[PDB]
């Protein structure tokens, strides 16, 4: 049942012509075979993205994310911010079985587990979730925070994102501070005095799952110091 349900290769050499694919694997329905799916897409003249790139997605190609389910990875967050549809790998399989492109809207993967809704949420077109938002990122980790949330927020329509390490801005011009327990007490006190909300990354992630700016103090996990 497995090898057959994985599907064959597309006879139409140009089945996926004009589509770019960004596959992501949830950390460990038929199981996701990343390289086999890549072979199926490449055989139908599908273009495989090395990583997220809005220079081809916003231009010639119709980008789509391929995954086995909803996951909390960088590619998933970038597509949730850019509004790129999250589509199950079965869509590839079921299409190669038919040698005809299937409606990916029937293969939409969920966004994730919502804290406000207390359940897994189905995906809807986002159309920017951080419009007109000035964010200050404060952290000790530069790569998986100062760069990660910078790119994710910027591709989400943020008006401005500033990157500040936990040792060295305009402040008051910002709308929210996204940090972690490595936030210095100076930033916390200055933000408190200015009535500037300070949240954790879970507020951003939940904003991506729900698809809209949710309340800063809506859930206890939104606090940066949540230990």
């Amino acid at each position: 049942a497995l090898e057959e349900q994985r599907g064959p290769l597309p006879l139409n050499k140009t089945l996926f012509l004009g589509y770019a694919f960004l596959l992501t694997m949830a950390t460990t329905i038929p199981p996701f075979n990343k390289q086999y799916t890549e072979s199926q897409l490449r055989a139908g003249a599908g273009y495989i993205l090395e990583d997220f790139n809005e220079a081809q997605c916003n231009t010639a190609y119709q980008c789509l994310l391929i995954a086995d389910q909803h996951c909390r990875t960088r590619k998933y967050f970038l597509c949730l911010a850019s509004g790129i549809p999250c589509v199950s790998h079965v869509w590839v399989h079921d299409s190669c079985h038919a040698n005809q492109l299937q409606n990916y809207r029937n293969y939409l993967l969920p966004a994730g587990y919502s804290l406000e809704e207390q359940r897994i949420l189905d995906w809807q077109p986002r159309e920017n979730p951080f419009q007109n938002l000035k964010v200050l990122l404060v952290s000790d980790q530069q790569q998986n925070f100062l760069e990660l949330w910078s790119e994710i927020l910027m591709t989400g329509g943020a008006a401005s994102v500033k990157q500040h390490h936990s040792s060295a801005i305009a402040l008051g011009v910002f709308d929210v501070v996204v940090t972690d327990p490595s936030c210095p007490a100076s930033v916390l006190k200055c933000a408190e005095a200015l009535q500037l909300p300070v949240v954790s990354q879970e507020w951003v992630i939940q904003c991506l799952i729900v698809g809209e700016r949710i309340g800063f103090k809506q859930h206890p996990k939104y606090k940066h110091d949540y230990v």
Binding site: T24, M25, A26, T27, C71, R72, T73, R74, K75, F77, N144, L148, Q201, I205
Partner: peptide
């Protein structure tokens, strides 16, 4: 990939 790595999840967050």
């Amino acid at each position: 990939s790595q999840e967050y």
